[PDB]
């Protein structure tokens, strides 16, 4: 099932009963987690306009509130809706490093509460956050759903259609390979991988990203 907004700006696509991918327009992906305690997003959107519209679309459809968002790094595609989160009382989780970079770049601060490995539970939905090391950015994290074996790779992970690394001005191209290897070691059985941008794949996306780094 795939549901679009008023224009084609915002699309949501069901992965399973409780997990959707959100995509906004260059495209950008996140998750929507439909939990018994509320909706949880992995990642916001480009700006406050799109973030508000995403929150409203999912609140209406799932008939519950967005309670929490996990921010996967401090660039605009991820943190651009932070103002909106804070003024609506939506908790914005991040690592300390992501928060510090957010503040350095003039954005409102997320919580800085995530560690190298953090295990969260929202109602019945388990969510693990993992900092694998530097790659696309210094601060990039991935998100793992152990009940579905679904990995949210973020911009650390490139889609099949991606033919180069994209924006590397903030990247660590020597360390990015070790970081991907750390993900592959930690999560040996992956059902789906959601890249930061592009189509959902599997572990092949991590192997593709390694090849792009050669
Ligand atoms: Zn980025
Ligand atoms: Zn990105």
């Amino acid at each position: 099932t795939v549901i679009k907004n008023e224009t084609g700006t915002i699309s949501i696509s069901q992965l399973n009963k409780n997990v959707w991918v959100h995509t906004e327009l260059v495209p950008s992906n996140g998750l929507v987690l439909n939990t018994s305690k509320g909706l949880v997003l992995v990642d916001s959107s480009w700006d406050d306009k799109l973030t508000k519209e995403l929150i409203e679309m999912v609140e209406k459809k799932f008939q519950k509130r967005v309670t929490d968002v996990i921010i996967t790094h401090a660039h605009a595609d991820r943190i651009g809706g932070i103002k909106t989160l804070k003024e609506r009382g939506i908790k914005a989780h991040s690592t300390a490093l992501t928060a510090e970079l957010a503040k350095k770049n003039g954005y409102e601060e997320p919580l800085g509460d995530l560690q190298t490995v953090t295990n969260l539970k929202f109602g019945n939905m388990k969510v693990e956050t993992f900092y694998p090391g530097k790659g696309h950015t210094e601060d990039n994290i991935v998100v793992w759903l152990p009940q579905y074996n679904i990995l949210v790779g973020g911009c650390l992970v490139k889609s099949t259609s991606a033919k180069d690394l994209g924006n590397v001005a903030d990247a660590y191209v020597n360390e990015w390979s070790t970081s991907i290897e750390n993900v592959l070691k930690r999560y040996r059985n992956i059902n789906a991988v959601v890249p930061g941008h592009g189509e959902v794949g599997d572990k092949g996306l991590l192997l593709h990203t390694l090849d792009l780094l050669k």
Side-chain angles (χ1 to χ4, degrees), residues 34-36 38-46:
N34 188 9
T35 93
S36 61
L39 300 165
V40 172
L41 307 178
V42 184
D43 284 321
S44 86
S45 193
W46 295 96

PDB file of all heavy atoms in Angstrom, residues 34-46, unseen atoms left out:
ATOM      1  N   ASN A  34       4.142   2.486  13.541  1.00  0.00           N
ATOM      2  CA  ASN A  34       2.826   2.561  14.113  1.00  0.00           C
ATOM      3  C   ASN A  34       2.843   1.725  15.378  1.00  0.00           C
ATOM      4  O   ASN A  34       2.843   0.510  15.315  1.00  0.00           O
ATOM      5  CB  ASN A  34       1.789   2.062  13.136  1.00  0.00           C
ATOM      6  CG  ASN A  34       0.389   2.297  13.607  1.00  0.00           C
ATOM      7  OD1 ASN A  34       0.140   2.993  14.601  1.00  0.00           O
ATOM      8  ND2 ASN A  34      -0.540   1.718  12.889  1.00  0.00           N
ATOM      9  N   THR A  35       2.924   2.383  16.523  1.00  0.00           N
ATOM     10  CA  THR A  35       3.041   1.663  17.791  1.00  0.00           C
ATOM     11  C   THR A  35       1.780   1.851  18.643  1.00  0.00           C
ATOM     12  O   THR A  35       0.919   2.710  18.369  1.00  0.00           O
ATOM     13  CB  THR A  35       4.294   2.085  18.629  1.00  0.00           C
ATOM     14  OG1 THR A  35       3.922   3.136  19.555  1.00  0.00           O
ATOM     15  CG2 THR A  35       5.478   2.497  17.705  1.00  0.00           C
ATOM     16  N   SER A  36       1.684   1.086  19.727  1.00  0.00           N
ATOM     17  CA  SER A  36       0.487   1.162  20.576  1.00  0.00           C
ATOM     18  C   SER A  36       0.475   2.431  21.444  1.00  0.00           C
ATOM     19  O   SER A  36      -0.595   2.816  21.963  1.00  0.00           O
ATOM     20  CB  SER A  36       0.346  -0.110  21.431  1.00  0.00           C
ATOM     21  OG  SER A  36       1.451  -0.277  22.287  1.00  0.00           O
ATOM     22  N   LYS A  37       1.655   3.051  21.609  1.00  0.00           N
ATOM     23  CA  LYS A  37       1.828   4.293  22.346  1.00  0.00           C
ATOM     24  C   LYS A  37       1.906   5.574  21.481  1.00  0.00           C
ATOM     25  O   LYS A  37       2.062   6.679  22.013  1.00  0.00           O
ATOM     26  CB  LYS A  37       3.080   4.219  23.242  1.00  0.00           C
ATOM     27  N   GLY A  38       1.788   5.441  20.163  1.00  0.00           N
ATOM     28  CA  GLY A  38       1.874   6.608  19.305  1.00  0.00           C
ATOM     29  C   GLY A  38       2.677   6.264  18.064  1.00  0.00           C
ATOM     30  O   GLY A  38       3.164   5.144  17.916  1.00  0.00           O
ATOM     31  N   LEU A  39       2.849   7.232  17.195  1.00  0.00           N
ATOM     32  CA  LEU A  39       3.694   7.056  16.016  1.00  0.00           C
ATOM     33  C   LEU A  39       5.100   7.541  16.320  1.00  0.00           C
ATOM     34  O   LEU A  39       5.304   8.565  16.974  1.00  0.00           O
ATOM     35  CB  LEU A  39       3.133   7.851  14.853  1.00  0.00           C
ATOM     36  CG  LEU A  39       1.728   7.472  14.431  1.00  0.00           C
ATOM     37  CD1 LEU A  39       1.209   8.609  13.524  1.00  0.00           C
ATOM     38  CD2 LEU A  39       1.717   6.185  13.648  1.00  0.00           C
ATOM     39  N   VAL A  40       6.052   6.800  15.828  1.00  0.00           N
ATOM     40  CA  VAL A  40       7.460   7.175  16.000  1.00  0.00           C
ATOM     41  C   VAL A  40       7.993   7.318  14.580  1.00  0.00           C
ATOM     42  O   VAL A  40       7.835   6.414  13.783  1.00  0.00           O
ATOM     43  CB  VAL A  40       8.202   6.138  16.810  1.00  0.00           C
ATOM     44  CG1 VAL A  40       9.731   6.415  16.830  1.00  0.00           C
ATOM     45  CG2 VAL A  40       7.643   6.055  18.262  1.00  0.00           C
ATOM     46  N   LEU A  41       8.721   8.387  14.281  1.00  0.00           N
ATOM     47  CA  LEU A  41       9.403   8.514  12.993  1.00  0.00           C
ATOM     48  C   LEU A  41      10.904   8.284  13.157  1.00  0.00           C
ATOM     49  O   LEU A  41      11.482   8.699  14.146  1.00  0.00           O
ATOM     50  CB  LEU A  41       9.189   9.918  12.422  1.00  0.00           C
ATOM     51  CG  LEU A  41       7.748  10.404  12.300  1.00  0.00           C
ATOM     52  CD1 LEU A  41       7.786  11.850  11.741  1.00  0.00           C
ATOM     53  CD2 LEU A  41       6.822   9.500  11.504  1.00  0.00           C
ATOM     54  N   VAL A  42      11.489   7.590  12.190  1.00  0.00           N
ATOM     55  CA  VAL A  42      12.927   7.654  11.977  1.00  0.00           C
ATOM     56  C   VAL A  42      13.091   8.693  10.877  1.00  0.00           C
ATOM     57  O   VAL A  42      12.718   8.451   9.706  1.00  0.00           O
ATOM     58  CB  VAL A  42      13.501   6.305  11.547  1.00  0.00           C
ATOM     59  CG1 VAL A  42      15.083   6.434  11.437  1.00  0.00           C
ATOM     60  CG2 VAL A  42      13.146   5.307  12.578  1.00  0.00           C
ATOM     61  N   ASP A  43      13.672   9.811  11.290  1.00  0.00           N
ATOM     62  CA  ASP A  43      13.942  10.998  10.521  1.00  0.00           C
ATOM     63  C   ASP A  43      12.734  11.875  10.224  1.00  0.00           C
ATOM     64  O   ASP A  43      11.637  11.357  10.082  1.00  0.00           O
ATOM     65  CB  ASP A  43      14.798  10.692   9.283  1.00  0.00           C
ATOM     66  CG  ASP A  43      16.276  10.475   9.669  1.00  0.00           C
ATOM     67  OD1 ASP A  43      16.771  11.200  10.545  1.00  0.00           O
ATOM     68  OD2 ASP A  43      16.929   9.563   9.111  1.00  0.00           O
ATOM     69  N   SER A  44      13.027  13.184  10.171  1.00  0.00           N
ATOM     70  CA  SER A  44      12.080  14.279   9.913  1.00  0.00           C
ATOM     71  C   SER A  44      12.043  14.463   8.384  1.00  0.00           C
ATOM     72  O   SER A  44      12.137  13.500   7.629  1.00  0.00           O
ATOM     73  CB  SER A  44      12.423  15.589  10.797  1.00  0.00           C
ATOM     74  OG  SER A  44      13.434  16.609  10.282  1.00  0.00           O
ATOM     75  N   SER A  45      11.957  15.693   7.925  1.00  0.00           N
ATOM     76  CA  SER A  45      12.083  15.931   6.489  1.00  0.00           C
ATOM     77  C   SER A  45      12.940  17.152   6.244  1.00  0.00           C
ATOM     78  O   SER A  45      13.478  17.731   7.182  1.00  0.00           O
ATOM     79  CB  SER A  45      10.703  16.000   5.798  1.00  0.00           C
ATOM     80  OG  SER A  45      10.833  15.922   4.368  1.00  0.00           O
ATOM     81  N   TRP A  46      13.075  17.510   4.965  1.00  0.00           N
ATOM     82  CA  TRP A  46      13.942  18.605   4.497  1.00  0.00           C
ATOM     83  C   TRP A  46      13.832  19.924   5.265  1.00  0.00           C
ATOM     84  O   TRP A  46      14.838  20.613   5.476  1.00  0.00           O
ATOM     85  CB  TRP A  46      13.648  18.893   2.988  1.00  0.00           C
ATOM     86  CG  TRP A  46      14.005  17.759   2.079  1.00  0.00           C
ATOM     87  CD1 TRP A  46      13.169  16.783   1.610  1.00  0.00           C
ATOM     88  CD2 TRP A  46      15.305  17.477   1.539  1.00  0.00           C
ATOM     89  NE1 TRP A  46      13.869  15.920   0.798  1.00  0.00           N
ATOM     90  CE2 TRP A  46      15.191  16.289   0.780  1.00  0.00           C
ATOM     91  CE3 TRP A  46      16.568  18.101   1.644  1.00  0.00           C
ATOM     92  CZ2 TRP A  46      16.289  15.708   0.096  1.00  0.00           C
ATOM     93  CZ3 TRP A  46      17.665  17.500   0.983  1.00  0.00           C
ATOM     94  CH2 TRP A  46      17.501  16.313   0.216  1.00  0.00           C
TER      95      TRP A  46
END
